[PDB]
Amino acid sequence: SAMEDFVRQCFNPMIVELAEKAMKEYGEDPKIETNKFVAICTHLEVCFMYSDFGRFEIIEGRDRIMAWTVVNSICNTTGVEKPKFLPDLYDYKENRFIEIGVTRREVHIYYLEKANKIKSEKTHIHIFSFTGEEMATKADYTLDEESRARIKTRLFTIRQEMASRSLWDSFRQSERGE
Ligand SMILES: O=C1c2c(O)c(=O)ccn2N([C@@H]2c3ccccc3SCc3c2ccc(F)c3F)[C@@H]2COCCN12
Ligand SMILES: [Mn+2]
Ligand SMILES: [Mn+2]
């Protein structure tokens, strides 16, 4: 599959290895769900960039046990309420958990979907598209504009490499089902 080749060529081996472990956890095959594979790599990379953007602890890219160990440690030392689902980051400055979303759809739709899912006002949502759009809880985008710019540039680049390989249309229609 050209998509698996693109994923392994454009993404860091550490990212790819972590995405493959996540996919194994949920019983998904990166050789069949290749578009998801690349989606998981992309969002992992966004989360890592966001975190180095500070300030942030990363919850994503860890296995469930260690990830919940970190979340509980945070809730014990800061007293922030325990989230109902694994978030992606913890903000020590604003002392709040953060869910990152990356969409090939309109950011407002994905934001509404995420907010309906977590149903907890406490966790902050930050949605990124592949064309520079973003939607965040209370339009509190957390990061400075240079940092968000670097994230947005990397996402657009991925979209354009996919486009270069005639992979973008398939990728786009894979996010939502019928
Ligand atoms: O952590 C996440 C997750 C997010 O944090 C997210 O933002 C979007 C989507 N997620 N989901 C991720 C995921 C992460 C990034 C991009 C796409 C996917 S798509 C479903 C799936 C995920 C992981 C492995 C796998 F095999 C999957 F099928 C699942 C939902 O619940 C549990 C963990 N998780
Ligand atoms: Mn996550
Ligand atoms: Mn996320």
Residue numbers in the entry: -1 to 52, 75 to 198
Report text from the authors:
Baloxavir marboxil (BXM) and its active metabolite baloxavir acid (BXA) is a first-in-class inhibitor targeting the influenza virus polymerase PA N-terminal endonuclease domain (PAN) that was approved in Japan and the United States in 2018.6 The RNA-dependent RNA polymerase of the influenza virus cannot synthesize its own 5′-mRNA cap, which is necessary for eukaryotic translation. To overcome this, the polymerase engages in a unique “cap snatching” mechanism, in which the polymerase subunit PB2 captures host pre-mRNA and PAN cleaves 10–13 nucleotides to serve as a primer for viral mRNA synthesis by the PB1 subunit. PAN is a metalloenzyme that is essential for viral replication, is highly conserved, and is not naturally occurring in humans, making it an attractive antiviral target.
Although it was hypothesized that the A36V mutant would disrupt BXA binding by disrupting α3, the DSF experiments revealed that the A36V treated with BXA did not show a significant change in ΔTM. This suggests that the A36V mutation causes very minimal or no change at all to the binding of BXA. The structure of A36V in complex with BXA indeed shows no notable changes in the binding mode of BXA to the protein when compared to WT. No large changes to α3 such as rotamer changes, or changes to the overall structure of the helix were observed. The change from alanine to valine does change the side chain from a methyl to an isopropyl which changes both the conformational entropy and hydrophobicity of α3.27 A36V is partially surface exposed so it is possible the mutation promotes local or global unfolding. The E23K and A36 V structures are the first reported structural data for these mutants and may aid in studies to develop a structure–activity relationship (SAR) for these variants.
